[PDB]
Design brief:
The complex is a heterotetramer, with one copy of chain A and three copies of chain B.
Chain A (H helix, E strand, L loop, with lengths): L2 E8 L15 E5 L2 E8 L2 E8 L5 E7 L3 E4 L5 E6 L3 E6 L5 E6 L4 E6 L4 E6 L2 E6 L10 E5 L8 E7 L5 E10 L2 E10 L4 E6 L2 E7 L9 E9 L6 E8 L12 E5 L10 E7 L4 E6 L3 E6 L5 E6 L5 E7 L4 E6 L3 E7 L4 H7 L4 H11 L5
Antiparallel strand pairs in A: 1-28, 2-3, 3-4, 4-5, 6-7, 7-8, 8-9, 10-11, 11-12, 12-13, 14-15, 15-16, 16-17, 18-19, 19-20, 20-21, 22-23, 23-24, 24-25, 26-27, 27-28
Helix pairs in contact in A: 1-2
Chain B lengths: L7
Subunit structure (chain C): Interacts with the clathrin adapter GGA2 and the clathrin adapter complex AP-1.
Organism (chain C): Saccharomyces cerevisiae (strain ATCC 204508 / S288c)
Protein name (chain C): Epsin-5
Chain lengths: 363, 7, 5, 7
């Protein structure tokens, strides 16, 4: 009722084999494109699904074994032999970057519209892809710390200012998936090890601060020993000109007793509406209000395992991909969210917070 | 390191 | 520490 | 090195 739930595309319907519909081969940097690396008789290829053009599919052979699209532009990044990276504008045919890293890339993701992020066995790096220095290697941000040892790296996120960063690894510990995050402040050149499976940097407009957002970091964890889930929201880098500060928030994330090996797989936030969308691997969607941390809604949108996710619809929602190749989207209903909070949550104060932030009806 | 996210 | 987490 | 993709 308080959300719209839709299917963006069925990847099996486009002829993609199940062996490629997983974290190894399918990437989702934004709601604009899905990229599937495929292989056939020794030859690699890319299927680029353009969600902004009726799920139009571009199919091309390539020499690399990993490929991602830019969040908005027709710019493809391709990798071979671990270390060799080339980045091309598909429209102009221009080569934007061509370099070899010192160590194999084991994870990458666009951090912003300008900057591509890389994680190796021991290092975390970024590339200013559009600066025109075609052969310049990625710059070292920081060495990986011991807390990410023996993990599979599954995310790398940054704030828009590109001075706060988080790298997420998971490991299996006593038959449960534990999450480890290296949080890095570029300004202080210091890292901090925290427990968490998911992370994002976002912004919130608080009363008193005019049109200037404050920055918050949102992270979700599931304690591998107790099973207890926890969402936390905390401010970073407060501009002293702004009188209103974000007060730290902590909320429970509920996991049923029989979802033993489940954990948070993704978190996206609507800045405009102040809504946190948290998805689990088993396909449970959780909504929280950003200002207060209040739990709004919990449901299950799929019984198939989710492996990746991205912002949806001008970053006001979340889209995800499951192992059956279904690309699913959730966003709040702008007409029904305030009535739901008012009538179903019986929370007049929260209803007003949401209505006022979003310019929404119902209050 | 196994592919944990896809288990 | 960097942050209260 | 050869282009990893030919456009």
């Amino acid at each position: 009722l308080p959300i719209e739930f839709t299917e963006l595309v069925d990847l099996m319907s486009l002829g993609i084999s199940p062996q490629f519909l997983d974290f190894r081969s399918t990437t989702f940097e934004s709601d604009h494109f899905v990229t599937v690396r495929e292989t056939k008789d020794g030859t690699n290829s890319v299927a680029i699904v353009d969600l902004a053009k009726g799920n139009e599919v571009t199919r091309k052979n390539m020499g690399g074994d990993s490929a991602i699209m830019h969040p908005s532009q027709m710019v493809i990044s391709v990798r071979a032999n671990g270390t060799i990276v080339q980045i091309f504008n598909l429209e102009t045919k221009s080569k934007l970057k061509s370099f070899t890293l010192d160590e194999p890339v084991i994870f990458w993701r666009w951090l912003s519209e300008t900057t591509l992020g890389f994680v190796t066995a021991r290092s975390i790096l970024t590339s200013n892809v559009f600066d025109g220095n075609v052969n310049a290697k990625p710059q070292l941000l920081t060495l990986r710390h011991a807390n990410l040892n023996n993990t599979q790296i599954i995310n790398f996120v940054a704030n828009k200012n590109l001075d706060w960063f988080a790298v997420v690894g998971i490991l299996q510990e006593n038959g449960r998936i534990a999450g480890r995050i290296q949080l890095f402040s570029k300004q202080r050149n210091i890292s901090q090890a925290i427990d968490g499976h998911v992370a994002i940097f976002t912004n919130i407009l608080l009363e008193g601060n005019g049109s200037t957002p404050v920055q918050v970091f949102v992270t979700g964890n599931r304690n591998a020993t107790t099973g207890a889930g926890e969402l936390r929201i905390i401010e970073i880098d407060h501009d002293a000109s702004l009188p209103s500060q974000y007060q730290k928030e902590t909320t429970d994330i509920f996991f049923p007793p029989d979802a033993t090996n489940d954990f948070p797989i993704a978190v996206q936030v609507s800045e405009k509406y102040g809504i946190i969308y948290l998805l689990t691997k088993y396909g449970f969607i959780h909504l929280y209000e950003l200002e207060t941390g209040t739990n709004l809604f919990v449901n299950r949108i799929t019984a198939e395992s989710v492996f990746t996710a991205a912002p949806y619809n001008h970053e006001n929602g979340i889209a995800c991909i499951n192992k059956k190749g279904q690309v699913l989207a959730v966003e709040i209903s702008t007409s029904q969210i305030v009535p739901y909070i008012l009538n179903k949550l019986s929370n007049v104060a929260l209803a007003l917070i949401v209505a006022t932030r979003g310019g929404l009806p119902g209050a | 390191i196994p592919d944990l996210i896809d288990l």
